[PDB]
Amino acid sequence: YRYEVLTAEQILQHMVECIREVNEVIQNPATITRILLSHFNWDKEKLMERYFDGNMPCQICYLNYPNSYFTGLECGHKFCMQCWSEYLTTKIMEEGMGQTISCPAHGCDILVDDNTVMRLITDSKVKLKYQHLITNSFVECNRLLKWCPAPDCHHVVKVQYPDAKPVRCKCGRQFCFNCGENWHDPVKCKWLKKWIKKCIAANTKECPKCHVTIEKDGGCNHMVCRNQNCKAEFCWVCLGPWEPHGSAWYNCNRYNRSRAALQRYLFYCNRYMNHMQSLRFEHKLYAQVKQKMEWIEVQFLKKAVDVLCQCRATLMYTYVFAFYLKKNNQSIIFENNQADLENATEVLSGYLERDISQDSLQDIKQKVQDKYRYCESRRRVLLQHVHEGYEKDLW
Ligand SMILES: [Zn+2]
Ligand SMILES: [Zn+2]
Ligand SMILES: [Zn+2]
Ligand SMILES: [Zn+2]
Ligand SMILES: [Zn+2]
Ligand SMILES: [Zn+2]
Known part of the structure; x- marks a missing residue:
C-alpha cells in the first residue's frame, strides 16, 4: 500500500504550486486565488467554467526605526517589522481567525498576502497555526490527502489511492486512512x-x-x-x-x-x-x-x-x-x-x-x-x- 508523509511545510509548498498553476490568465494575487479555489472546494474546473462566464515614526509603537524595518501592504500603510510581527501573531489567535488577515489600520481592510505572513511571524508554532489554517481547505477537499488524527500533530499522509489501510505518521500515531480511527x-x-x-x-x-x-x-x-x-x-x-x-x-x-x-x-x-x-x-x-x-x-x-x-x-x-x-x-x-x-x-x-x-x-x-x-x-x-x-x- 503506497503512502507518504508530508510536513505542514511540504503541503503548503504543494498548495502554492496548485495556486500558481491556476494563476493565468486570471493573474490574481496568489492569496486571492487561494480564497477563490478554497471556495470552490478546489475543483479547478468549476472555478474555470465560472471564470469564462463571469462573477518617519511607526504609528503603532511610536519609536523611530529609520527606514528598514518598515514593510507595508499595498495600501501604502507603512509599519515597522516587529510591530507587524505582533499584529499577525495575535490576529492568528482566537477568535474569528479566518483564512485571511486584513491590513492593521482596519480602515482599508485590504488583505496581507500569504508569503509576507510567512516571512514576518517569528516564533514558529504560530507560523504553523497559520500554515494549517490556510492549508486546511486544500487538504480536506483532496481525496489523496488526509490530516493526521493526533491533536498536536500538523503532518499529513498522502496516498496513491484511498484504500482503508493502516498508515503511520512518525507521529508516531497509526490510523486507518479511510475513517481516521485506530487500526481495526x-x-x-x-x-x-x-x-x-x-x-x-x-x-x-x-x-x-x-x-x-x-x-x-x-x-x-x-x-x-x-x-x-x-x-x-x-x-x-x-x-x-x-x-x-x-x-x-x-x-x-x-x-x-x-x-x-x-x-x-x-x-x-x-x-x-x-x-x-x-x-x-x-x-x-x-x-x-x-x-x-x-x-x-x-x-x-x-x-x-x-x-x-x-x-x-x-x-x-x-x-x-x-x-x-x-x-x-x-x-x-x-x-x-x-x-x-x-x-x-x-x-x-x-x-x-x-x-x-x-x-x-x-x-x-x-x-x-x-x-x-x-x-x-x-x-x-x-x-x-x-x-x-x-x-x-x-x-
Ligand atoms: Zn512599530
Ligand atoms: Zn492599509
Ligand atoms: Zn501525526
Ligand atoms: Zn477505518
Ligand atoms: Zn468464559
Ligand atoms: Zn473462591
Missing part, C-alpha cells in the same frame, strides 16, 4: 463508527464457588480465587469454570416486543469492553519488562507483551465484527477461530501476569516463546479467514 483489521469501517456511537463492566465481581469478592488487577481473564476454602479457577467474563474453556464443547464467546436486542447487545459490549480493560492492564506490563531483561537473547520478552497486547486489540475488533454479523456458515467457523485466539491469549496473558515468576529462570524462554508464537499464529488464521471472507461477500 478484522472489522469494516462503517460498522466501527456505528459501534463507537454506543460506547459499568464491573471492576468488581464475586467468585462463583465461595462468593468472595475480587476486584481485577490485570488483565488476564483466567482467575484463581484467593482462599484457603476454595482455590478454584474460573473465567472473568462468564464467571464459569476454567478450563473446559477453549475446548470444542464449551464456548464462552458465542451467543444463543424484543428485549433480546438489548440483551445480546450487552453480550458483545461486555466482551469488547472487557478486552479493553484487559488491554489497558496489559500495557503497564511494558515498564515491568525492562526489569526482568537481564541482549538479543533477552528481548523476546518485549515481543510477548507486544503480541499479547496486539491480540487484545484484534479481539475487541472481532467482537465488533461479530455483533453486526448475521449468522451463517462462516459465522460458525470465525466464531471458532476466535475462541482459539481468545484462549491462546488468556493463556499467554496469564503466563506473564501470573505463572512466570512462580516458574524457574531457565525455563521461561522456552515457554514464553511457544506461548506467543501460537498466540500470534491463532490471530493470523482468524484474520486471514475473515479476509478471504470479505472477498466472497459471505457476511
Whole structure:
C-alpha cells in the first residue's frame, strides 16, 4: 500500500504550486486565488467554467526605526517589522481567525498576502497555526490527502489511492486512512463508527464457588480465587469454570416486543469492553519488562507483551465484527477461530501476569516463546479467514 508523509511545510509548498498553476490568465494575487479555489472546494474546473462566464515614526509603537524595518501592504500603510510581527501573531489567535488577515489600520481592510505572513511571524508554532489554517481547505477537499488524527500533530499522509489501510505518521500515531480511527483489521469501517456511537463492566465481581469478592488487577481473564476454602479457577467474563474453556464443547464467546436486542447487545459490549480493560492492564506490563531483561537473547520478552497486547486489540475488533454479523456458515467457523485466539491469549496473558515468576529462570524462554508464537499464529488464521471472507461477500 503506497503512502507518504508530508510536513505542514511540504503541503503548503504543494498548495502554492496548485495556486500558481491556476494563476493565468486570471493573474490574481496568489492569496486571492487561494480564497477563490478554497471556495470552490478546489475543483479547478468549476472555478474555470465560472471564470469564462463571469462573477518617519511607526504609528503603532511610536519609536523611530529609520527606514528598514518598515514593510507595508499595498495600501501604502507603512509599519515597522516587529510591530507587524505582533499584529499577525495575535490576529492568528482566537477568535474569528479566518483564512485571511486584513491590513492593521482596519480602515482599508485590504488583505496581507500569504508569503509576507510567512516571512514576518517569528516564533514558529504560530507560523504553523497559520500554515494549517490556510492549508486546511486544500487538504480536506483532496481525496489523496488526509490530516493526521493526533491533536498536536500538523503532518499529513498522502496516498496513491484511498484504500482503508493502516498508515503511520512518525507521529508516531497509526490510523486507518479511510475513517481516521485506530487500526481495526478484522472489522469494516462503517460498522466501527456505528459501534463507537454506543460506547459499568464491573471492576468488581464475586467468585462463583465461595462468593468472595475480587476486584481485577490485570488483565488476564483466567482467575484463581484467593482462599484457603476454595482455590478454584474460573473465567472473568462468564464467571464459569476454567478450563473446559477453549475446548470444542464449551464456548464462552458465542451467543444463543424484543428485549433480546438489548440483551445480546450487552453480550458483545461486555466482551469488547472487557478486552479493553484487559488491554489497558496489559500495557503497564511494558515498564515491568525492562526489569526482568537481564541482549538479543533477552528481548523476546518485549515481543510477548507486544503480541499479547496486539491480540487484545484484534479481539475487541472481532467482537465488533461479530455483533453486526448475521449468522451463517462462516459465522460458525470465525466464531471458532476466535475462541482459539481468545484462549491462546488468556493463556499467554496469564503466563506473564501470573505463572512466570512462580516458574524457574531457565525455563521461561522456552515457554514464553511457544506461548506467543501460537498466540500470534491463532490471530493470523482468524484474520486471514475473515479476509478471504470479505472477498466472497459471505457476511
Ligand atoms: Zn512599530
Ligand atoms: Zn492599509
Ligand atoms: Zn501525526
Ligand atoms: Zn477505518
Ligand atoms: Zn473462591
Ligand atoms: Zn468464559
